[PDB]
């Protein structure tokens, strides 16, 4: 009852309880990170070559700072803990963040932000730090492709005849990358591969339509 075995299992119960509490805390942090990252994405989708592209962009950078602050807390919550141990609790959140910053970066620079470039921003001092796993990164970029096809079709809609082709190129590259990796990668990633093919097709088909229409000199008027 106060026996040695019972003492052991009490320290076990306290230890576990502590770990599960930390896990739950991280899960709430991760949900919040996910929601705010997706909101950032929705915002960025508001850009339309129109003037406010700058303001929008700036505002997104504000939101992302906020998200990073959440991430900061996660880093604190994890100090003195083994990295991947609590990973299942935050992976989704991280992935969403990856989708967000990368989307933003593509909007600004037409390039793919690297894993290390993303981590660079996840260092905080007063000094804590968090690193996105290559797999978090991979999944997040996969989703990024869907947001990009969304942007391509959107632009076609509002008269843009440049953007679509830029996206088609970037997406052809990313697809070739995932095909390079192939089955030397985690199951999750291969799951992505199909939806990835879907997106690529939609964009190449958009650009094809543009090429066909725009190459036409009509000889019959109305």
């Amino acid at each position: 009852s106060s026996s040695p075995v019972m003492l052991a299992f009490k320290s076990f119960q306290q230890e576990l309880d502590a770990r599960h509490d930390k896990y739950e805390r991280l899960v709430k942090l991760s949900r919040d990170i996910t929601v705010e990252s997706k909101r950032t994405i929705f915002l960025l989708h508001r850009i339309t070559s129109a003037p406010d592209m700058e303001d929008i962009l700036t505002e997104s950078e504000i939101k992302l700072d906020g998200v990073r602050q959440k991430i900061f807390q996660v880093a604190q919550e994890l100090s003195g803990e083994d990295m991947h141990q609590f990973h299942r609790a935050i992976t989704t959140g991280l992935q969403e963040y990856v989708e967000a910053v990368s989307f933003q970066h593509f909007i600004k620079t037409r390039s793919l932000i690297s894993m290390d470039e993303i981590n660079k921003q996840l260092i905080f001092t007063t000094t804590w730090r968090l690193r996105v796993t290559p797999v978090d990164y991979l999944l997040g970029v996969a989703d990024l492709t869907g947001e990009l096809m969304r942007m391509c079709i959107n632009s076609v809609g509002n008269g843009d005849i440049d953007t679509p082709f830029e996206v088609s190129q970037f997406l052809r590259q990313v697809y070739d990358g995932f095909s390079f990796i192939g089955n030397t990668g985690p199951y999750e990633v291969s799951k992505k591969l199909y939806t990835l093919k879907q997106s690529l097709a939609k964009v190449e088909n958009a650009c094809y339509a543009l090429k066909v229409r725009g190459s036409e000199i009509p000889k019959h008027m109305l």
């Binding site: 929705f42 969304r150 079709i153 809609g157 509002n158 339509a209 036409e216 009509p218 109305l222």
Partner: protein, 214 residues
């Protein structure tokens, strides 16, 4: 207590809810009948607009009485217990109303306007409400109908229609882009709006290139 007592009450509640579901299903089947009839009337350019709009609004009365009938089939404050069982039809109706209102005025119907057309109480008045999400869905359906309409218009020589539809639908797009959506039915349907907008934009291009700079 008594376990038998408890489960008898519950089998009760459940049998009751099942009855409510079947009554609501009868009324809803009637409403789908009417909605299909209305849509048939409104097409159309697919053209005395005021006339067909008129007949349609006449059928909307059948709709009114039927929805007032539905109100009596279930507990007013248990709307969302049974929401899913009319959500689809309610959206189709929002769509039809919006479509009538468009063909006439070339404007987007307001929610309160749609409620008044259907025989329903605004959000401020206790009663059968129109969920914001069901509204939005109806509007998306409209947008789809309208891209189709722009194409068939150009086929019928009505070369002015596509440009009006263009302004309207581009406006809708800007609106929806303002929303932050969960991964639900509404986001799924919204995802098609961009394609509707694209189709219309294409039609407009074809026209401008073929001697129609307006």
């Amino acid at each position: 207590m008594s376990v038998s007592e408890i489960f008898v009450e519950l089998q009760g509640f459940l049998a009751a809810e099942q009855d409510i579901r079947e009554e609501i299903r009868k009324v809803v089947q009637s409403l789908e009948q009417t909605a299909r009839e209305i849509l048939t009337l409104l097409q159309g350019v697919h053209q005395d607009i005021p006339k067909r709009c008129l007949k349609a609004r006449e059928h909307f009365g059948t709709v009114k009485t039927h929805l007032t009938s539905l109100k009596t089939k279930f507990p007013a404050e248990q709307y969302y217990r049974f929401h899913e069982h009319w959500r689809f039809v309610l959206q189709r109706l929002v769509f039809l109303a919006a479509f009538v209102v468009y063909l006439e005025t070339e404007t987007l119907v307001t929610r309160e306007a749609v409620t008044e057309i259907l025989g329903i109480e605004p959000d401020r008045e206790k009663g059968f409400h129109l969920d914001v999400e069901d509204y939005l869905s109806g509007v998306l359906i409209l947008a789809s109908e309208l891209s189709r309409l722009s194409v068939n218009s150009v086929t019928a020589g009505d070369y002015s229609r596509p440009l009006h539809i263009s302004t309207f639908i581009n406006e809708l797009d800007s609106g929806f882009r303002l929303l932050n959506l969960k991964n639900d039915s509404l986001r799924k349907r919204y995802d098609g709006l961009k394609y509707d907008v694209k189709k219309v934009e294409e039609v407009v291009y074809d026209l401008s290139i073929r001697g129609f700079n307006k």
